[PDB]
Short mmCIF file of C-alpha atoms in Angstrom, two decimals:
data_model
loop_
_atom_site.label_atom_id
_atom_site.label_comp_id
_atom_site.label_asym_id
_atom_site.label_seq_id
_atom_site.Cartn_x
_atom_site.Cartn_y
_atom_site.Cartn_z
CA UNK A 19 75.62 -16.92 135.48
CA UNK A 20 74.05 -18.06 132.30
CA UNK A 21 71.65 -16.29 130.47
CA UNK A 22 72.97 -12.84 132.13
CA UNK A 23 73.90 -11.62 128.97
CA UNK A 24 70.79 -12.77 126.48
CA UNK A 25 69.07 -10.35 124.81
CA UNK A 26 66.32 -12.55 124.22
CA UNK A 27 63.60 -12.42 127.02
CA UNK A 28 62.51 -16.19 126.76
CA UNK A 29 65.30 -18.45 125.57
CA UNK A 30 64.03 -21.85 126.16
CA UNK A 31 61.32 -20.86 123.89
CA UNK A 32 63.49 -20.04 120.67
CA UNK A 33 65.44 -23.06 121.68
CA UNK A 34 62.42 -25.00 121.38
CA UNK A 35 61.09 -23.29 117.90
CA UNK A 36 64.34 -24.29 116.52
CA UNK A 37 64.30 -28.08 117.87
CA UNK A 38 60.42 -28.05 116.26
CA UNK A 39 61.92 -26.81 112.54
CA UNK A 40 64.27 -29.52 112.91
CA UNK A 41 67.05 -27.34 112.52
CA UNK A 42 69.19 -28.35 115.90
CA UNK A 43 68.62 -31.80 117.72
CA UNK A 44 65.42 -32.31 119.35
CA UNK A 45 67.47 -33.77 122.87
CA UNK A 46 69.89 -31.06 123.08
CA UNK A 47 69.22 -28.80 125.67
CA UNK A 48 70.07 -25.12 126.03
CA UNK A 49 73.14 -24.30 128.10
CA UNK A 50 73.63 -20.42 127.38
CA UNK A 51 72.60 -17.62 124.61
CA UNK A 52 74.70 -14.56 124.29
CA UNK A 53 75.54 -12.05 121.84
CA UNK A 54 77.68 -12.88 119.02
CA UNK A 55 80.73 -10.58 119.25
CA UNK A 56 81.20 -8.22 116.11
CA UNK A 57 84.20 -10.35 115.22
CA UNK A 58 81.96 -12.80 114.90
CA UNK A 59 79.61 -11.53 112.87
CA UNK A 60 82.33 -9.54 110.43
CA UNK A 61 83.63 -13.34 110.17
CA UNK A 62 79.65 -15.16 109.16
CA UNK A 63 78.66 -11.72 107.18
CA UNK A 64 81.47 -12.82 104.90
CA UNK A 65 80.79 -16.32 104.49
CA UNK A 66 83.49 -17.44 106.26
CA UNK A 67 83.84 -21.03 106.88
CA UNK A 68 86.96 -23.99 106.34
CA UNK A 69 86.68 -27.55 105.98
CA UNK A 70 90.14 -28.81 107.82
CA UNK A 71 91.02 -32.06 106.30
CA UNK A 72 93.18 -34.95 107.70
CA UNK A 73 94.60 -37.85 105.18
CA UNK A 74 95.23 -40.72 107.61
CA UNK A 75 97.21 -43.80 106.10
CA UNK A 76 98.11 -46.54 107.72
CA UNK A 77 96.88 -50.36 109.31
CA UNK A 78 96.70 -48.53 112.81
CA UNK A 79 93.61 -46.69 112.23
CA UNK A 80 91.09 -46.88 114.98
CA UNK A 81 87.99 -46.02 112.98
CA UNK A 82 85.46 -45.95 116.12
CA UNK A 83 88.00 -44.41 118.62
CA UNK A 84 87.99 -41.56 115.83
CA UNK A 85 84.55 -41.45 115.85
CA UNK A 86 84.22 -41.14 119.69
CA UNK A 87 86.86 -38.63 119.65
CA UNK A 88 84.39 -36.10 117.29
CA UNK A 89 81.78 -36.27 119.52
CA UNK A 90 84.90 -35.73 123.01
CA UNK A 91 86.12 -32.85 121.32
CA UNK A 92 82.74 -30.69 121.01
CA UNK A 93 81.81 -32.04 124.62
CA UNK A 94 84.83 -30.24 125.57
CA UNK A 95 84.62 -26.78 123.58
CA UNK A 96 81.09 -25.36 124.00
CA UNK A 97 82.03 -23.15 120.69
CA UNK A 98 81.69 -26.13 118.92
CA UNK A 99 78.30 -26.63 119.81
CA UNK A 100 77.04 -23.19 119.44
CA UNK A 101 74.29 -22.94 116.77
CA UNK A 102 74.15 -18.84 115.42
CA UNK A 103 70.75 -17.09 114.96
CA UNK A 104 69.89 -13.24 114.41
CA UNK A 105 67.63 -11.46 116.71
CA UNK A 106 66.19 -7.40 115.95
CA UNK A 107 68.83 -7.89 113.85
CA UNK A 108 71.58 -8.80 114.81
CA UNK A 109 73.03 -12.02 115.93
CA UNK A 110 73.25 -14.18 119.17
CA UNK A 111 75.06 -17.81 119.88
CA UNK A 112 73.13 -20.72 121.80
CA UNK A 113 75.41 -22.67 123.00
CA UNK A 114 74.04 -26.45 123.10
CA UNK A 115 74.25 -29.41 125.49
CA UNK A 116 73.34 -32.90 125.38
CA UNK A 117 74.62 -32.61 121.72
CA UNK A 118 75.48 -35.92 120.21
CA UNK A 119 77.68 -35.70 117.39
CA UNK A 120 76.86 -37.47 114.02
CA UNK A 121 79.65 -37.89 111.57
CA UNK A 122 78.53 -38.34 107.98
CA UNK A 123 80.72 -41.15 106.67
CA UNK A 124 81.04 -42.12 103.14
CA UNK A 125 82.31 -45.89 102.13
CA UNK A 126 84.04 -45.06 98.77
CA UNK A 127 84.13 -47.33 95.43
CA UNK A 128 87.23 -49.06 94.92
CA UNK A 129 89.72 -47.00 93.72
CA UNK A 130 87.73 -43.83 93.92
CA UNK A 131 89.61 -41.42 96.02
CA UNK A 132 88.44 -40.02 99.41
CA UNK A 133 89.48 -36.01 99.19
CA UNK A 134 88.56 -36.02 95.46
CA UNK A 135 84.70 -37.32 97.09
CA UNK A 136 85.09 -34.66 99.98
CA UNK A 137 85.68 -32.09 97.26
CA UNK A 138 82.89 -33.12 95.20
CA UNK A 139 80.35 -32.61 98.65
CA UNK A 140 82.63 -29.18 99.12
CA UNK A 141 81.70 -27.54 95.75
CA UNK A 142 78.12 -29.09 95.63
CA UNK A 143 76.56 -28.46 98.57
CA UNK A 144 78.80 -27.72 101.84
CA UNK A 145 79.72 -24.18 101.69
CA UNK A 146 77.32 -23.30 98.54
CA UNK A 147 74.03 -23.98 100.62
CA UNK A 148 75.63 -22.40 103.85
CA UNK A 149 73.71 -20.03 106.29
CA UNK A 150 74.90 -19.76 109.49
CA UNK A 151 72.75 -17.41 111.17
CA UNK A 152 69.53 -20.24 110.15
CA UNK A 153 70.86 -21.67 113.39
CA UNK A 154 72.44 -24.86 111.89
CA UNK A 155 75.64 -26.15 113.82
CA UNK A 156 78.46 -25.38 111.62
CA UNK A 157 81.11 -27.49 113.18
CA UNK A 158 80.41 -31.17 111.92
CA UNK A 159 82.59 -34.00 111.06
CA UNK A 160 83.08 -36.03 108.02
CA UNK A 161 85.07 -39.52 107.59
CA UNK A 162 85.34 -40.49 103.81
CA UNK A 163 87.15 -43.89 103.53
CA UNK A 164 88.83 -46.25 101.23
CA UNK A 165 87.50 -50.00 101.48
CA UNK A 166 90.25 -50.95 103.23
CA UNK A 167 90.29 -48.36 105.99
CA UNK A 168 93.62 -47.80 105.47
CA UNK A 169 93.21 -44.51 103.63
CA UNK A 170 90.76 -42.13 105.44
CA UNK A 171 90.39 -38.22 105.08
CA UNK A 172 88.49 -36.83 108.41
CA UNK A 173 87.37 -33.19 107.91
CA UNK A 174 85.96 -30.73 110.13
CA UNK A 175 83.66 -27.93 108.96
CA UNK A 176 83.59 -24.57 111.17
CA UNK A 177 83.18 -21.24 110.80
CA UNK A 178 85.86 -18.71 111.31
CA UNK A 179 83.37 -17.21 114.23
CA UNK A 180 84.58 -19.88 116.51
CA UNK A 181 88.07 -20.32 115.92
CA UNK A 182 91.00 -18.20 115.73
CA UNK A 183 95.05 -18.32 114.43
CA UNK A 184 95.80 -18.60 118.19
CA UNK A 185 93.61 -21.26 119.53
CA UNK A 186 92.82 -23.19 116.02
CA UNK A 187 96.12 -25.46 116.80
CA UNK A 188 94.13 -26.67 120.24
CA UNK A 189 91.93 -27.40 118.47
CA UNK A 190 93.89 -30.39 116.60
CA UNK A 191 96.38 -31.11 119.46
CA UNK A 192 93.09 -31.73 121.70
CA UNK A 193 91.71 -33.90 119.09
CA UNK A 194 95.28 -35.88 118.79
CA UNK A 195 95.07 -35.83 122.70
CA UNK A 196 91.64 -37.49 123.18
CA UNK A 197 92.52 -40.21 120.41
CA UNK A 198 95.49 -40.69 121.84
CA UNK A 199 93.55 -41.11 125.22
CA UNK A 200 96.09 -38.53 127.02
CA UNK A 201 93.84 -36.60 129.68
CA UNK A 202 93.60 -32.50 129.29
CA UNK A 203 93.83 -29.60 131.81
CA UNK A 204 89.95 -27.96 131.90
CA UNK A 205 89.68 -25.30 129.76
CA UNK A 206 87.25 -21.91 129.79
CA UNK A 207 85.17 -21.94 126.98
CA UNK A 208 84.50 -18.35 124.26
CA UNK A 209 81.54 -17.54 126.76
CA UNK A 210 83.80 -17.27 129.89
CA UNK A 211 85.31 -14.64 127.09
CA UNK A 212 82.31 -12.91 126.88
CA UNK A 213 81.57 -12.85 130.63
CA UNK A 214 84.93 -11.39 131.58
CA UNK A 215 84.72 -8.54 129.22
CA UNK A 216 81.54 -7.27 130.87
CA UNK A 217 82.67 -8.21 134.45
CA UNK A 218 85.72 -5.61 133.79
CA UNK A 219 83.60 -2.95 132.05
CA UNK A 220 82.39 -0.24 134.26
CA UNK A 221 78.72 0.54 134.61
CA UNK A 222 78.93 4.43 134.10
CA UNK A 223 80.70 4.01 130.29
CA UNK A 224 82.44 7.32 130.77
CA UNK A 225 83.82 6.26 134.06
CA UNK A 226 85.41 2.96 131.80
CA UNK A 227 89.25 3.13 131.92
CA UNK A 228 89.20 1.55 128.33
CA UNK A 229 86.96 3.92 126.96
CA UNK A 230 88.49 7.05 128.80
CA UNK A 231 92.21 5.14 126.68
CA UNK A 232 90.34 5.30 122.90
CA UNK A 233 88.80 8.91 123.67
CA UNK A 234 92.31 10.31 124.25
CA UNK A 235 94.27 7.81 121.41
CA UNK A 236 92.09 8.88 118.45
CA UNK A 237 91.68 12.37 120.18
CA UNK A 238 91.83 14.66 117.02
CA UNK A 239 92.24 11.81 114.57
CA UNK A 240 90.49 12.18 111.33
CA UNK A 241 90.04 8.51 109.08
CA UNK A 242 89.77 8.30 105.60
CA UNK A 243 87.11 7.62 103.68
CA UNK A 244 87.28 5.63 100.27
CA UNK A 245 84.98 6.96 97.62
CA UNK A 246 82.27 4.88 96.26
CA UNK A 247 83.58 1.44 95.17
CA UNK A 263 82.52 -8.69 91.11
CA UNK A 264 84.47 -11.35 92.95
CA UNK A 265 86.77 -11.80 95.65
CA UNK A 266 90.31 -11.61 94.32
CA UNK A 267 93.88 -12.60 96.50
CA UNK A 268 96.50 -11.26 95.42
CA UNK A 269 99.97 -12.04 96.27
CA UNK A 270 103.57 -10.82 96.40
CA UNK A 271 106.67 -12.77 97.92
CA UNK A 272 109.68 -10.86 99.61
CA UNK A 273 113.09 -11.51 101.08
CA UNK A 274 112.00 -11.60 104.90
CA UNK A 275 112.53 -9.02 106.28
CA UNK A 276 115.76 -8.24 108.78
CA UNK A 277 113.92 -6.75 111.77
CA UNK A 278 116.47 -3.70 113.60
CA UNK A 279 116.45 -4.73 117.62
CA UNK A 280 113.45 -3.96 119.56
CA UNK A 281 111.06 -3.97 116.60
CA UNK A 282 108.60 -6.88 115.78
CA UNK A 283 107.79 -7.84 111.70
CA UNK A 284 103.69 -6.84 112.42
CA UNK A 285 105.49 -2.89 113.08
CA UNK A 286 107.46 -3.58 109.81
CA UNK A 287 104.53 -3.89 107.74
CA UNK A 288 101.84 -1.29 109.57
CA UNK A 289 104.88 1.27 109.41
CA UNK A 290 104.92 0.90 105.79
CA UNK A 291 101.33 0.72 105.15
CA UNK A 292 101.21 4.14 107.03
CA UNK A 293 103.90 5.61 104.96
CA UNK A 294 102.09 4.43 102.12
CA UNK A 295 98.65 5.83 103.14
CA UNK A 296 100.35 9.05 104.30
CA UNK A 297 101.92 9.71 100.29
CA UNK A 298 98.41 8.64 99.14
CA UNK A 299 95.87 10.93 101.30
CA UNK A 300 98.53 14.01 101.47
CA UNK A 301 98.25 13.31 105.43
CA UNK A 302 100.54 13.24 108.54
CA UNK A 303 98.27 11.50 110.61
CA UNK A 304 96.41 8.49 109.46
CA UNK A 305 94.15 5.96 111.09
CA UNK A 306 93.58 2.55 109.61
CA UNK A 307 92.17 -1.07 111.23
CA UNK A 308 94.85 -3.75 112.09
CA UNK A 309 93.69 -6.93 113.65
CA UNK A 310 94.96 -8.00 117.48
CA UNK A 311 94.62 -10.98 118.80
CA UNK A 312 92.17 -10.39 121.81
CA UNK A 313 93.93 -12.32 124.33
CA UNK A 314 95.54 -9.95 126.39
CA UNK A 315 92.82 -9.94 129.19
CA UNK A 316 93.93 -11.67 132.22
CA UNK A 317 91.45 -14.77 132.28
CA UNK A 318 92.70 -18.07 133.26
CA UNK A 319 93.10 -20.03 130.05
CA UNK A 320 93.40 -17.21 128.15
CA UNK A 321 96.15 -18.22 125.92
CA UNK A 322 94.36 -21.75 125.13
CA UNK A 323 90.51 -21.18 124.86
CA UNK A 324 88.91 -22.37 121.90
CA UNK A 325 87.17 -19.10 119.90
CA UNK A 326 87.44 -16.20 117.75
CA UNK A 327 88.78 -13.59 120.34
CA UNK A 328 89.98 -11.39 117.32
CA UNK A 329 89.30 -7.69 117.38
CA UNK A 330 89.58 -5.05 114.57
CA UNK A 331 90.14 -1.77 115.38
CA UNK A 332 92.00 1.46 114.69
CA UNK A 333 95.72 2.01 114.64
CA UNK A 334 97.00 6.18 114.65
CA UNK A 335 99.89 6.89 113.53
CA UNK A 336 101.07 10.23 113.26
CA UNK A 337 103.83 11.68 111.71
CA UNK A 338 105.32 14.92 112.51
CA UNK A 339 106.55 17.82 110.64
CA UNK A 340 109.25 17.94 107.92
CA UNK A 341 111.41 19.80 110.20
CA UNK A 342 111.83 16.89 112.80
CA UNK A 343 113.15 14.66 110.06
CA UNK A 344 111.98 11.49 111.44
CA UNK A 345 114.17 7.89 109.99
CA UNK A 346 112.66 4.94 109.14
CA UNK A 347 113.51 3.84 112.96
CA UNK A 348 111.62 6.88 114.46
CA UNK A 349 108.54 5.35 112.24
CA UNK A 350 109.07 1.88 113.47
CA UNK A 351 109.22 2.85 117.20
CA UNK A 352 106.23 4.83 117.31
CA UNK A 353 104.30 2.45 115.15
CA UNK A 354 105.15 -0.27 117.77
CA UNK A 355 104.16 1.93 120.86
CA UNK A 356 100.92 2.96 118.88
CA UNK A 357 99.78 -0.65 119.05
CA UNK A 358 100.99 -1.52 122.66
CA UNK A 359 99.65 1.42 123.89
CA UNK A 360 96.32 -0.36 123.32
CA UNK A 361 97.10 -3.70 124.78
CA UNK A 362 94.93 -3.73 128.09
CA UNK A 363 91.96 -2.02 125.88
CA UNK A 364 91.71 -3.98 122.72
CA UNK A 365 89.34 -6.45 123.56
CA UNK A 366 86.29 -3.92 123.28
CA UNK A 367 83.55 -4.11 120.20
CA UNK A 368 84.58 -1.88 117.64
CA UNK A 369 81.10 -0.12 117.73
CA UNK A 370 81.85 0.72 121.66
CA UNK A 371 85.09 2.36 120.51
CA UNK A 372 83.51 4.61 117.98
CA UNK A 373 80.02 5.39 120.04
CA UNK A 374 81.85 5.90 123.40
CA UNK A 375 85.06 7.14 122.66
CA UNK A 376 84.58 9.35 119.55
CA UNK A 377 82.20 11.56 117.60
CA UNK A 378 81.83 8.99 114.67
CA UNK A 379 78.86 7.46 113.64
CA UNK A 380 78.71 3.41 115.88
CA UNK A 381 78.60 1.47 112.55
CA UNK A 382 81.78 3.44 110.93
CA UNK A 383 83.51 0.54 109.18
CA UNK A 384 87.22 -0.03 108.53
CA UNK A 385 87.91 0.45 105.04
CA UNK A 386 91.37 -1.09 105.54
CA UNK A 387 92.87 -3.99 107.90
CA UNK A 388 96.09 -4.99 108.31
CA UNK A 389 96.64 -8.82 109.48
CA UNK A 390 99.87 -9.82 110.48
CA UNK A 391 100.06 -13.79 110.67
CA UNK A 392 102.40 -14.23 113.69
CA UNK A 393 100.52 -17.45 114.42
CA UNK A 394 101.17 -21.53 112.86
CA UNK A 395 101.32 -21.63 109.53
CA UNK A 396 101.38 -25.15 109.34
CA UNK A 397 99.68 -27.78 111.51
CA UNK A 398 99.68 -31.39 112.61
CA UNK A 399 97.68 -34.57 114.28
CA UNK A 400 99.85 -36.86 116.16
CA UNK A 401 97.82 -40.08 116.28
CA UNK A 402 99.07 -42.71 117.97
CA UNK A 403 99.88 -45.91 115.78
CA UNK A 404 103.01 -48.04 114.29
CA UNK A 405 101.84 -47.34 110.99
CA UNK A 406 99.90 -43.90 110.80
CA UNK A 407 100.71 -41.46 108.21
CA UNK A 408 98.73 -38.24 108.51
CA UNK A 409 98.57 -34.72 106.40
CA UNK A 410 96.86 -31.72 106.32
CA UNK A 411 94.73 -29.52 103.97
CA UNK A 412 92.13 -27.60 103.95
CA UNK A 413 89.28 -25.87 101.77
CA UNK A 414 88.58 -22.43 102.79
CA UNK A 415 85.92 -19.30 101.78
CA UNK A 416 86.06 -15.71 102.79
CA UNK A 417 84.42 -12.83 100.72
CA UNK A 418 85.04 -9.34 101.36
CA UNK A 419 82.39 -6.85 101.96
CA UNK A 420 83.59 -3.18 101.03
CA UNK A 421 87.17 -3.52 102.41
CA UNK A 422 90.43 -4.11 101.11
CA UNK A 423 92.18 -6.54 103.60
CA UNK A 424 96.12 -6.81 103.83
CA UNK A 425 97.59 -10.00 105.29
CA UNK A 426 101.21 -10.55 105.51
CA UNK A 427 102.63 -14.57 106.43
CA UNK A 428 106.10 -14.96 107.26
CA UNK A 429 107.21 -18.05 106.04
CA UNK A 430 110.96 -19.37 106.06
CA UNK A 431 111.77 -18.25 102.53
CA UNK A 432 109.65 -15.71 102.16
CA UNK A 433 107.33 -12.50 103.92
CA UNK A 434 104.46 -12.80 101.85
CA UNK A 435 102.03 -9.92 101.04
CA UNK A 436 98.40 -10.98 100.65
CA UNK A 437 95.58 -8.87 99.66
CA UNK A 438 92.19 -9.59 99.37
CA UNK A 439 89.47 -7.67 98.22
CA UNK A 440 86.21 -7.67 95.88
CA UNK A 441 87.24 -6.71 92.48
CA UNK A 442 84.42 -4.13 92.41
CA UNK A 443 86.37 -2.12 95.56
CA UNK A 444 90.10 -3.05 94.12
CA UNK A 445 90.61 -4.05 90.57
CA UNK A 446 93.20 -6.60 89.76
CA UNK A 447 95.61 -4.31 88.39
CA UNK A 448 95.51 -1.82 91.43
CA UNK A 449 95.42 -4.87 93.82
CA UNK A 450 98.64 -5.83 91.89
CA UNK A 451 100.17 -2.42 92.43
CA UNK A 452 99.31 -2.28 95.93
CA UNK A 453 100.58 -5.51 96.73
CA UNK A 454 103.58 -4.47 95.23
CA UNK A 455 104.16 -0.90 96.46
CA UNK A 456 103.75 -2.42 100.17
CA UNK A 457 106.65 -5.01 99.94
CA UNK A 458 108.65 -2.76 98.46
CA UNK A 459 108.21 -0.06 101.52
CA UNK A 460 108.87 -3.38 103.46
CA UNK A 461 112.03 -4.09 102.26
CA UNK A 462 113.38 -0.50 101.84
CA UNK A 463 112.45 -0.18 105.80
CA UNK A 464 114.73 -3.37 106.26
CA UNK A 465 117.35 -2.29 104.20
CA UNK A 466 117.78 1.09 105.50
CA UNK A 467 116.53 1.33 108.91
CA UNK A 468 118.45 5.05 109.13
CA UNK A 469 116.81 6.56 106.02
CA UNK A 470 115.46 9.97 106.30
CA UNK A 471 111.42 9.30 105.66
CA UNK A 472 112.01 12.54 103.34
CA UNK A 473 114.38 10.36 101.25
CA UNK A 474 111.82 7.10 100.73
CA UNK A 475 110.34 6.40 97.34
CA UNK A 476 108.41 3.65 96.60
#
């Protein structure tokens, strides 16, 4: 039932104050208001928003059935008509209807070229005036052409609070879908998310099979604590990918190493650190396809016993994986739940570390329809770190590659260097000797 969830007494009302600052469209009415997940807001604290560009060449082009498809694709996913706003604080989605979508369109000069003009609007005012909790949609659509219509670049603006590595290529095989006039299965949309969660969380917390699961995993569990900590800096190392031994997926490859590498580091056997998970392991009918940002961080233990056991590199790997899928039916929780209901730490305890693993497309298409139709992707992107040091790893064909970012303030280029480094190389050494005695690694 909508509304069920709002925090906000009167909806309509703020609905209407924002329709009377002219910051959402006066005929759109109000379909739902919920609270933004703290995903989401980790995601908009952190300015977190992509421009997803399409180059479309070719004499097939149907410029108004592109148009048309724009405003089909948001009718479909009410995530792309959310508009964000913070209340007491903290920050709540409206999700819109009877939203017509606008594209801003730009008829180029001869010879001047479309991305180099979508740039240009980039840089100067698209993600430089950004602020999506002033309510303003942020998914909107922009079709910069060449005279001829024969070279186009469509992009689509959105913030990483309503899209995910999961669902983001639905979003594009959708849009290729509705152009292509092909009819789609329904969908649930991110609030049916939302409204599942709380339909399969107890009333009496303590009584919550979830919480009673965190209580017992981080039972005991002590988490570091960086010392006091400029720009955002990536920084990134290439490796042979990894051979995995039998059993063992390449996200357990790189936690297990980035808990043998904490472990050296803190003089500890039993370390707890943030890793991202993908959300989707609730069972909710379109689950695997909604459009959203059902990622989650939260802790991963892993705990290492004494000398005397002599754990291998294996023994690491195993427990590693079970210390992950352990959590699968109780991921989906808010961070902040975990800690209040489940522990003795203070609610607003942040990670200090999170590990991403990228099993998801790394590359991404649009099918349209036509005899001649060339089209490629690319994308613009921004994402600034608050106080954490983020670790992504992307397994390409030729390469695993190690990614960190982090502000330069809380890891200086150098040290981001060295830790890029001193992961991969636990990486591979894991690979190469699966058997190894963890009393025998060096990195």
């Amino acid at each position: 039932e909508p509304f069920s969830l709002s925090p906000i007494k009167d909806p309509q009302a703020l609905h209407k104050e924002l329709c009377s600052k002219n910051v959402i469209p006066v005929t759109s009415t109000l379909e739902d208001l919920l609270p933004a997940t703290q995903a989401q807001h980790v995601f908009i604290k952190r300015g977190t928003f992509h421009s997803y560009n399409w180059t479309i060449k070719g004499r097939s082009l149907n410029m108004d059935r592109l148009r048309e498809t724009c405003q089909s694709l948001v009718d479909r996913h009410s995530i792309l008509r959310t508009s964000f706003v913070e209340h007491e604080g903290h920050p709540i989605q409206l999700v819109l209807a009877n939203l017509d979508v606008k594209v801003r369109e730009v008829q180029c000069w001869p010879g001047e070229d479309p991305m180099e003009v979508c740039k240009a609007l980039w840089d100067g005012k698209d993600w430089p005036t950004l602020n999506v909790l002033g309510g303003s949609l942020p998914v909107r659509f922009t079709l910069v052409s060449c005279p001829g219509n024969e070279h186009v670049v469509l992009t689509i603006q959105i913030s990483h609070s309503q899209w995910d590595g999961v669902s983001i290529p639905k979003l594009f095989s959708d849009f290729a879908a509705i152009y292509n006039q092909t009819p789609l299965p329904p969908t649930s949309d991110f609030a049916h998310y939302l409204y599942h969660r709380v339909s399969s969380a107890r009333e009496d917390v303590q009584q919550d099979p979830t919480f009673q699961f965190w209580r017992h995993y981080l039972d005991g569990a002590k988490m570091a604590v960086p010392f006091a900590p400029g720009q955002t800096l990536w920084t990134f190392k290439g490796i042979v990918p990894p051979t995995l031994p039998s059993g063992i997926t390449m996200a357990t490859l790189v936690k297990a190493a980035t808990a043998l590498f904490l472990s050296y580091h803190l003089g500890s056997r039993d370390v707890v650190f943030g890793h991202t998970v993908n959300g989707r392991n609730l069972p909710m009918d379109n689950i695997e396809s909604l459009l959203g940002c059902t990622l989650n961080f939260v802790p991963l233990r892993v705990t290492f016993p004494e000398d005397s056991t002599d754990w291998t590199v294996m023994d690491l790997l195993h427990h590693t994986q079970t210390q992950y899928t352990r959590a699968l039916s109780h991921e989906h929780v808010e961070l902040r739940d975990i800690f209040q209901h489940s522990t003795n730490w203070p609610a607003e305890t942040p990670l200090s570390l999170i590990v991403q693993h990228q099993n998801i497309d790394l590359s991404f298409s649009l099918p349209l329809r036509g005899s001649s139709l060339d089209v490629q992707y690319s994308k613009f992107a921004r994402f600034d770190p608050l106080d954490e040091v983020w670790i992504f790893t992307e397994p390409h064909a030729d390469r695993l590659e190690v990614q960190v970012c982090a502000n330069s303030r809380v890891l200086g280029q150098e040290q981001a260097t060295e830790l890029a480094n001193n992961i991969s190389a636990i990486i591979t050494k894991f690979s190469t000797d699966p058997t190894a005695r963890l009393l025998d690694i060096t990195f």
